From a paper:
The green alga Chlamydomonas reinhardtii harbors a Moco carrier protein (MCP) that binds and protects Moco but is devoid of enzymatic function. Moco carrier proteins (MCPs) neither belong to the Moco-biosynthesis pathway nor qualify as Mo-enzymes as they are non-enzymatic proteins within molybdenum metabolism.
We chose the MCP homolog from the organism [name], a cyanobacterium belonging to the genus Rippkaea, a recently established phylogenetic lineage formerly assigned to the genus Cyanothece. This [name] MCP, referred to in the following as RoMCP, consists of 163 amino acids corresponding to a molecular weight of 17.1 kDa and shares 52.5% sequence identity with CrMCP. The electron density allowed the modeling of all amino acids of RoMCP in an uninterrupted polypeptide chain. In contrast, most amino acids of the affinity and cloning tags show disorder. The helices lie below (h1, h2 and h6) and above (h3, h4 and h5) a parallel β-sheet, resulting in a three-layered sandwich structure that resembles a Rossmann fold. In contrast to the canonical, six-stranded Rossmann fold, a seventh strand (denominated β4) expands the β-sheet of RoMCP, resulting in an arrangement with the order β4β3β2β1β5β6β7. However, CrMCP exhibits a tetrameric quaternary structure with 222 point-group symmetry generated from the content of the asymmetric unit by a twofold crystallographic rotation axis. This tetrameric assembly is identical to the content of the asymmetric unit in the RoMCP structure. PISA estimated the solvation free-energy gain upon the formation of dimer AB to be 90.0 kJ mol−1, which is significantly greater than that for the formation of dimer AC (55.6 kJ mol−1), indicating that the formation of the RoMCP tetramer follows the route via a dimer AB intermediate. We thus reason that the positively charged crevice and the chloride anions bound within it mark the [name] Moco-binding site of RoMCP.
Residue numbers in the entry:
A (entry chain DDD): 0 to 165
B (entry chain CCC): 0 to 162
C (entry chain AAA): 0 to 163
D (entry chain BBB): 0 to 164
The structure:
Amino acid sequence: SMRKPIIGVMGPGEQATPTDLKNAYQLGQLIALEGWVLLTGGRNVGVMEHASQGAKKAEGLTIGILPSKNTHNVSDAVDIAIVTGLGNARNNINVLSSDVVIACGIGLGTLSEVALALKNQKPVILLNDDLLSQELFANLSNNQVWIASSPENCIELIKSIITVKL
Amino acid sequence: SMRKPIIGVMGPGEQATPTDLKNAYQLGQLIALEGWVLLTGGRNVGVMEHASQGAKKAEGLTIGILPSKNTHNVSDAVDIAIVTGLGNARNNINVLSSDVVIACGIGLGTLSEVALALKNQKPVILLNDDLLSQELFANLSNNQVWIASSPENCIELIKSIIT
Amino acid sequence: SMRKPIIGVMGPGEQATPTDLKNAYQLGQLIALEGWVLLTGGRNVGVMEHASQGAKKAEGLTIGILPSKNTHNVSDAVDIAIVTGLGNARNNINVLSSDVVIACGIGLGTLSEVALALKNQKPVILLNDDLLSQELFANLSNNQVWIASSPENCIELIKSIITV
Amino acid sequence: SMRKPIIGVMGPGEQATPTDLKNAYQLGQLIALEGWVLLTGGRNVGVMEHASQGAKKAEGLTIGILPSKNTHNVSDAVDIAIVTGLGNARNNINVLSSDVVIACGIGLGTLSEVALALKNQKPVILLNDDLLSQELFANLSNNQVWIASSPENCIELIKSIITVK
Ligand SMILES: [Cl-]
Ligand SMILES: [Cl-]
Ligand SMILES: [Cl-]
Ligand SMILES: [Cl-]
Ligand SMILES: [Cl-]
Ligand SMILES: [Cl-]
Ligand SMILES: [Cl-]
Ligand SMILES: [Cl-]
Ligand SMILES: [Cl-]
Ligand SMILES: [Cl-]
């Protein structure tokens, strides 16, 4: 493949913590500064939107995988709107399309995406303060999930992951 | 609606524990005995297979929602094979189609289905031996998830929910 | 497989003509009288509604594959409501799930299902008065599609197909 | 929306004719020269492959919407590989995601996409030499479908559509 790495950033919306939102915005910037593509589920609030705005601040390309049948809710920070009409079934597209999936914070939708990514043997990085989810996913994935300490650490982990792929 | 209640029994496939299989068979029997319809992921392994066999022993109707593009892997105990060709994206159809979701055991696919069902505000009953999953879903659902003690207790809970 | 044959009856919804509705009801009834399961797109309009009503008149089992995320539009004659939340992507589930697909009338959604059925290597029977779609699908399918003259003829064709 | 127009080029894969492939390549180039994004079904065959290669020759961005669960079959000329695992259900994503759908040749998957696009009242342009398909879609769309004469005429039609829609 000559394609740029695609990094999926998943996380909560309205219930994202202040730390999740700061982490998301920083991640978006850092992904774009590497020349990587950012993929999100296209939500116009919370982690996905802060990540997308971060990437755009650093002139990166952003892809949104929308659950709706139209673009009515997509933000200006999404360059490419993939309109699925699949509702929450689109979560599987997010994970299959990503070279690495980062869960920035935790919530029900994020839990579903992490679970699907690990079932598909996709590399997953958790960036959150939820020890229960970390232990549960480590157990179910036979310790294949990665736990990051910061946005910068996520980028370091991605570089090690995509180097082993190569 | 004059339709019969559809109870979705989710749970591990190949990695199901022996207790998950015994619980799944008993759930299938008891669901069928109520005249309810059983929905599973449809394959010839694990909770899907055992629940479907339990329901068939009691002459219940069984629906399988298959992830592949044909019926190669279908349980012999599935009456209606819905072939989706969606892979793991069929998990959402399982949840949306169920009046109640029971998670019998734990694994990655089941975690995805429970999360989706709770996000849809579907009633969800956990029947497992995994205290981490029970505490995590109680927290994320603001204690709306039910934790069952047995297959019989799942049935009792469903009767309270659907009445 | 010990499962009953599943016959997918596709056709227009809101745009169905009175002829399509009569044909649909008769098809549903005959599918059920054969001891087969009827699958439709499940909604309370058009061929879906009338085929389902016909199958229920003969006490057959009916499956509806709904495009929305709830049962609000389901036919009262659907026994099993499979709620997909997929929109028109559910058309692929309709054809993958069917042993034979019947197109009862014509419209854009029905054309998409016929095309997907033929691409997914499923037997298709056309029961309509649309010569252009009949010729086009005969050409694209190297004459594997079947053209029926009546609801009874559809059942005759199914019996020949599911025998081999 | 400040997003670039996304033009979906649909058409036969394995069964594409030499004319379909020439038209597809030229379409891809012309879409990219307008600064538009090309969307295809993403695979390394037929119209998908040749449209993607034409767009890359003109340094355009290409999106591929793949039906399988990995990138095994992806065209080398796809920049963004959307892996769906949906099989032919991805055809709905192709049409929902496109501002205009061009059907470059005819085959069964293409017919499904044309039909779904028209059902959604998405603009559709047919570029083919099949008068049966042109008459059928004109009838079923109440003459809303467009019939193009050449790849260049497709671009002219897209400009007329983007202006009114
Ligand atoms: Cl979430
Ligand atoms: Cl499964
Ligand atoms: Cl399967
Ligand atoms: Cl599981
Ligand atoms: Cl419909
Ligand atoms: Cl519906
Ligand atoms: Cl139709
Ligand atoms: Cl394809
Ligand atoms: Cl593919
Ligand atoms: Cl085609």
